[PDB]
Amino acid sequence: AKTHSVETPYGSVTFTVYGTPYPYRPAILTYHDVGLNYKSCFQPLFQFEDMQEIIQNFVRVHVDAPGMEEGAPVFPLGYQYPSLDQLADMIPCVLQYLNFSTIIGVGVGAGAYILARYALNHPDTVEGLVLINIDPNAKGWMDWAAHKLTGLTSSIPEMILGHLFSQEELSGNSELIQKYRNIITHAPNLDNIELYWNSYNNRRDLNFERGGDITLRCPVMLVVGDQAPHEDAVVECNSKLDPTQTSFLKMADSGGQPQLTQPGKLTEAFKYFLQGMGYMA
């Protein structure tokens, strides 16, 4: 694995490349959720045994949001962190640096929004998208009021945790939940994480309409946990996208982070997703 950084209009971004480029295939490019990094977000999936057998035949580029990279400095107080749209705009710089011309994007939560935005802006560079927990809607006033009321008695880590996991997972307090609670609550870059969180909260409508012009032009696999926080947004997202090109993997017993709890079934879905795109997997 080789870690790189590239300069962009909005600051430096770090990414780690794994594997070897397969002739005339897209790179797999990932973007992680708020509170996480590529490792805490994607390691259980990309290191799953069945996944390793698929990804041998791809090069992989795992992006860390600015400030999330290993050994990131804490951005200065009052720093103007990139919006999600600006984050999406760092990806052309990444690909140009690597000389990769096309990708299959895999994103979770804010990372899914970013990869969707990227795909709208650069549709000829995107062969497919796996969009986990995607919520393409800006908060409306009712959302802002509820969020701010919640914020009065919840810490920043508790709120990020509530974005990642269901209330029931957070109450049940499994070993995975305990580990992720410590990760976020005691992160040395929590100030950086909070800026990314604010980004996410302030994102604009990703404005899919079934029947163009604002539509995704590529195969999409939508993923969400049954009864998880983002379920309604992913369901709604499924009704806006082109049905001939879109599959919806709504998983029972996966909770808020399906790529962490059910990497085996997700892997198998990815295999069929690649096959339906026309790649042997």
* Chain residues that interact with Cl ion, rule: CB under 5 A: 18, 46, 60
DSSP class of residue 241? S
Q: Find, among 64, 56, 14, 23, the residue nearest to 40 by Cα.
A: 64
CA distances from 203 to 8, 197, 198, 207 (A): 20, 10, 9, 12
Beta-carbon contacts of 275 under 8 Å, excluding residues fewer than 6 positions away, are 281
18 binds, among a copy of itself, Cl ion, none (CB under 5 to 8 A by kind): Cl ion
Choose the binding region for a copy of itself from 161-169, 178-186, 251-259, 273-281 (rule: CB under 8 A). Answer: 273-281
For the bound state, the minimum distance from the C-beta of residue 217 to a copy of itself, rounded and expressed in Å, comes to 8
25 binds, among a copy of itself, Cl ion, none (CB under 5 to 8 A by kind): a copy of itself
Separation of alpha carbons 270 and 247, rounded Å: 11
For the bound state, the minimum distance from the C-beta of residue 13 to a copy of itself, rounded and expressed in Å, comes to 25
- Which one of 218, 221, 241, 266 is in contact with a copy of itself (CB under 8 A)? 218
Contact 25, 128 (CB under 8 A): no
Size of site (CB under 8 A) for a copy of itself: 13
* Residues 172-211: x where in contact with a copy of itself by CB under 8 A, - otherwise, as a string: ----------------------------------------
For the bound state, the minimum distance from the C-beta of residue 23 to a copy of itself, rounded and expressed in Å, comes to 7
Q: Find, among 252, 243, 239, 166, the residue nearest to 209 by Cα.
A: 239
